Design a protein around this ligand. Structure first.
Ligand SMILES: [K+]
Ligand SMILES: [K+]
Ligand SMILES: [K+]
Ligand SMILES: [K+]
Ligand SMILES: [K+]
Ligand SMILES: [K+]
Ligand SMILES: [K+]
Ligand SMILES: [K+]
Ligand SMILES: [K+]
Ligand SMILES: [K+]
Ligand SMILES: [K+]
Ligand SMILES: [K+]
Ligand SMILES: [K+]
Ligand SMILES: [K+]
Ligand SMILES: [K+]
Ligand SMILES: [K+]
Ligand SMILES: [K+]
Ligand SMILES: [K+]
Ligand SMILES: [K+]
Ligand SMILES: [K+]
Ligand SMILES: [Mg+2]
Ligand SMILES: [Mg+2]
Ligand SMILES: [Mg+2]
Ligand SMILES: [Mg+2]
Ligand SMILES: [Mg+2]
Ligand SMILES: [Mg+2]
Ligand SMILES: [Mg+2]
Ligand SMILES: [Mg+2]
Ligand SMILES: [Mg+2]
Ligand SMILES: [Mg+2]
Ligand SMILES: [Mg+2]
Ligand SMILES: [Mg+2]
Ligand SMILES: [Mg+2]
Ligand SMILES: [Mg+2]
Ligand SMILES: [Mg+2]
Ligand SMILES: [Mg+2]
Ligand SMILES: [Mg+2]
Ligand SMILES: [Mg+2]
Ligand SMILES: [Mg+2]
Ligand SMILES: [Mg+2]
Ligand SMILES: [Mg+2]
Ligand SMILES: [Mg+2]
Ligand SMILES: [Mg+2]
Ligand SMILES: [Mg+2]
Length: 205
RNA sequence: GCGGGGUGGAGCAGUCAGGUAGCUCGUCGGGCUCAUAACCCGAAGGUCGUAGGUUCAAAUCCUGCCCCCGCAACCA
RNA sequence: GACGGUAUCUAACCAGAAAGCCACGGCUAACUACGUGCCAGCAGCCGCGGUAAUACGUAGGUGGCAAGCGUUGUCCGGAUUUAUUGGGCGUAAAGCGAGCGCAGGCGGUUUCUUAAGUCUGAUGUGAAAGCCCCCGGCUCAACCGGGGAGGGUCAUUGGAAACUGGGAGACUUGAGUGCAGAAGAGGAGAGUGGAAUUCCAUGUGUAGCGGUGAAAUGCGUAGAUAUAUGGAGGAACACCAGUGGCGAAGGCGGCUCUCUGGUCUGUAACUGACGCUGAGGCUCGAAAGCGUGGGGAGCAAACAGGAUUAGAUACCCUGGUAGUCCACGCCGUAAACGAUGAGUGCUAAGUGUUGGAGGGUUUCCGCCCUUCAGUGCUGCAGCAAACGCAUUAAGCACUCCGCCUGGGGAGUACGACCGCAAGGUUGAAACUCAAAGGAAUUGACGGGGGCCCGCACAAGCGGUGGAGCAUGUGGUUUAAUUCGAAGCAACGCGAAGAACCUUACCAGGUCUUGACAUCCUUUGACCACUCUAGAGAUAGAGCUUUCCCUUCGGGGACAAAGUGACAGGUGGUGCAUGGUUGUCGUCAGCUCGUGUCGUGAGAUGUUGGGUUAAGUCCCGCAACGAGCGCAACCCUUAUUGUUAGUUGCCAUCAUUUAGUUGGGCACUCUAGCGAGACUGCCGGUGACAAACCGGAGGAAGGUGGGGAUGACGUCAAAUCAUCAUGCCCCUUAUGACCUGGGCUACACACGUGCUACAAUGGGAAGUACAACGAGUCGCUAGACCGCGAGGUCAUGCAAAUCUCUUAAAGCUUCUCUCAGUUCGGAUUGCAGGCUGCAACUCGCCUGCAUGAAGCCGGAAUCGCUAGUAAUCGCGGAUCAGCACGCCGCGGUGAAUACGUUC
RNA sequence: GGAGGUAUGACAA
């Protein structure tokens, strides 16, 4: 059957909100500025392994923390690239933006990056079994307590869609204390959308 | 000309022996079934071919007339 | 010298004139694009084609072969698929139903002999050409020539002599005879016994009997059935009785006698291979059937009647003829079965039993051992596709016979033989299919079995189906009644808000780089507002008309224009998809790694014994572990310590109409941090286990109550209108703007609701008790106006402070008095109130008037196991306004569960 | 434990 979102289930139990601000009358305004901020960054930094955006609001300011496995690319030479990002965000948001780059250690354990990686390979006509197996290898070598991956759609151009997935170790989706990262990424192929889902189980909380 | 028949959609009673219009299957509506059949429950469908008489009252008795069916309509 | 100026040779000249055919899904060497969309076509077989075809057609490539390449036809091969080499017959095709036997095939030991078979030597011959072998010739090869070899079940002749055969002997083990015993439903004939059924007669006796799931037909007051005593007649033989016995098989069951077959065991006197098998022939051969003559109790095709049923030419019931029985003569077939031909020998064991034999003990009885022949069970080796067989082989061998060669057409046709007939025996082909089949495996299923669970049923309570109305759906209607959902799992569903908007539909009016983007662009503002026209969109006017900066060259931020790329689709396909969801179901399962078993698919684990809500745990186990689920971690609710004490609270105090003010946070409460339940404690049961039963303490006890949490998968289930997206389609349009209409249309059918049908009530008055929640142009106190909906001035509160919000059921009095009513409140008239630019189509509310059906609801059907159902209100999301819906909240608060057949 | 005997359901997918 259908399963609860692994992150939505643990938000407020062991996982915290990414939108780390409070508001009453500007809640609607702030929320949809965040969506424009998140959408803009996902376009500007599509080439950098940007995983988590945390937004904090202090009066007229907007503090934005960007987690990236390629901090050097995001920053650029002498902060050229991030500085061009604050100006673009300042124009977009209409207020002061501070951008904080955070280094993602162990990107092989970050579901979004792993899912994005598998998605890119499928777009290169890489064997879908191969793409998932080597993602599993990297995650386990990085020390994951377990990893689970799945690809759905018209695999290798098959007329009839099907889902093929692989797992290793433990992925206890019902254990609420388990720190299970999840991501869904889409790979657009010649035949249409392929859905890549990744579950990574790190040290339980 | 000799008989037989006209009553609900069809097939039949009731007609002799006057009082109250039904039975069989079917039709329609609802149930039951995944569905159909079977089954269950409700409803509808004729003032008795048609028009006069007799009577307190007729589908019934009397009379006519129109329809439908089997016979006959000529023998050495 | 016909060939003939032919071969051949030499010189010059030019790459110049000289390649195709088939195949490329697998077999099978060779792959991609278009085109086509179960069409056109391909195809040797399997099979391709249903709008993204390496299989159809074309092209480019590629493969094979090449002056050829392919197709068709024919033969051999592959084909062990007629098996001599070289197969089979328990269940796949295949053992004749069984015996007796002529011919034939085969046949024990041995001496001598022969030598037909067999083996061997020599000679003769097996023409030439041809294949093959050497050797030469043509420039090579083909081709030609020379020399050989090979080829015969050949003849003549000389040898050998084991084996088969012939001849003369000998032998005793096979086979038979004798002698001595053993058992038997073996057969035939003639008698005979009891039990029971039926009929008949006679008493007794009185209204039923009989029968089925339930009934009826039937029998009986003309005396039944039952009961007693008898008589008649037919058929079959209870107990004994037993994978017990006998027989070739079919078969044979009371007892007695007469005639008669066979088998088994000892003995070892006799014969001396006399044997085995056996086409063709002959004999026997269940049951049904046939003929002639008897018999006829019971049973029972047919048949009759009664039922069942949609129909029943059935199953069921009541009857009942042939037949079943006897004699004689036919028939000659059966899942005539061990679905396993006969004879012989050989190849572990264990244990029953029938008939014998021998010995060792036992007083006998019997026990012990050895053995023969049957009959069973279990089980090695071996065999087998497996199932299984296994000294009673399906094992290892030899002999003879029968039979088989894909399924269907066929055991049919024709012919023949046999038969009284019914039919039997023998037995094809055309044509057709690419399968039929055996065993085993995993699932699913069963009107199979066992064990369990769930408001599944049962036990209850209240409903739905009837009425009115609300709402969704079908249908119909319509210019449109937008699209989606359809068994559970569509139908108060997407819609948590259709008057306009929404809106996707329709009519009319309109626009064509566009309502919305990006990119180029240009002598920069654009909007905005104003007026006319217009339903409006829109036009035609007036009027204003932009910033950032750097050095002054400009650029960049934004329009707005221009123009071409492009935009735009709630257009299609949820059978191309991602995501999301329902569903089985919070049911307990679903698997993997390694090992092991199996030829194999698979199996094991995961089953078994317990236990649990649970694949929960324990124990056992050819398994040992692991993962996804279960459980736990999370939320809420029930008790409590501590910290905190306002806006919450008021016990001890004084005060106020007031928890008011002072004062205090003690209690309540709010909220963080903690405490508490863990089978932890105790008794019993249990396999020293898991666990179960009860107990104490405790606010809470065994998951405390509830929630969140939904395994691998299932239904090509839902969604291309949330979004996204492959492919397809539209592009002055299927895009876009506007006003109006529609989505709310109504002869009808269904789903879900609401309100009722009254007195456990209606009406009036008085009085009490919640919780979850919401609030800024919002929630609104208080006062005043209005019958009311509400209006007016005005107040507090961005809020455990103010407000919505004095909850309704409830309780206490009064009234009504069973009435379609003082029940019910549909429908309609009139008059108003709000929100809105506007409520005619289409809003909600109010007053007055009006006062419909409905008297508790057919078949059928739904929810619920307690703070639940039932009933009562309250808040919220969407929302200007608008729900009887949805989500949540508290009040009051039951009935029942024996039990698991359905 | 094992063994011989006593109503209906298009076609493709
Ligand atoms: K082909
Ligand atoms: K052979
Ligand atoms: K036989
Ligand atoms: K010889
Ligand atoms: K005898
Ligand atoms: K006879
Ligand atoms: K024996
Ligand atoms: K054939
Ligand atoms: K409906
Ligand atoms: K889907
Ligand atoms: K295994
Ligand atoms: K506390
Ligand atoms: K699409
Ligand atoms: K879409
Ligand atoms: K309703
Ligand atoms: K209703
Ligand atoms: K009262
Ligand atoms: K309106
Ligand atoms: K009702
Ligand atoms: K509202
Ligand atoms: Mg190939
Ligand atoms: Mg082709
Ligand atoms: Mg051959
Ligand atoms: Mg068979
Ligand atoms: Mg057979
Ligand atoms: Mg007979
Ligand atoms: Mg036969
Ligand atoms: Mg024996
Ligand atoms: Mg019940
Ligand atoms: Mg109703
Ligand atoms: Mg659909
Ligand atoms: Mg509209
Ligand atoms: Mg409109
Ligand atoms: Mg689907
Ligand atoms: Mg299982
Ligand atoms: Mg488990
Ligand atoms: Mg076990
Ligand atoms: Mg759980
Ligand atoms: Mg579908
Ligand atoms: Mg689309
Ligand atoms: Mg509607
Ligand atoms: Mg009444
Ligand atoms: Mg329950
Ligand atoms: Mg309640």
């Amino acid at each position: 059957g259908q399963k609860v979102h692994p992150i939505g289930m643990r938000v407020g139990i062991i996982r915290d909100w990414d939108a780390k601000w409070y508001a009453e009358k500007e809640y609607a305004e702030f929320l949809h500025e965040d969506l424009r901020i998140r959408k803009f960054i996902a376009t500007k930094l599509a080439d950098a392994a940007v995983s988590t955006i945390e937004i904090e609001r202090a009066a007229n300011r907007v503090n934005i923390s960007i987690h990236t496995a390629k901090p050097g690319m995001v920053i650029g030479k002498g902060g050229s690239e991030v500085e061009n990002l604050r100006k673009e965000l300042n124009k977009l948001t209409g207020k002061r933006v501070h951008i904080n780059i955070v280094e993602i250690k162990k990107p092989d354990l970050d579901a979004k990056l792993v899912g994005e990686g598998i998605a890119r390979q499928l777009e290169n006509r890489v064997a879908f079994r191969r793409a998932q197996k080597q993602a599993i290898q990297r995650a386990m070598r990085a020390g994951a307590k377990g990893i689970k991956t799945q690809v759905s759609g018209r695999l290798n151009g098959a007329d009839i869609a099907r889902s093929e997935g692989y797992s290793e170790g433990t992925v206890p989706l019902h254990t609420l204390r388990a720190d299970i990262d999840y991501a869904w990424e889409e790979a657009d192929t010649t035949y249409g959308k392929l859905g890549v889902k990744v579950w990574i189980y790190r040290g339980e909380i």
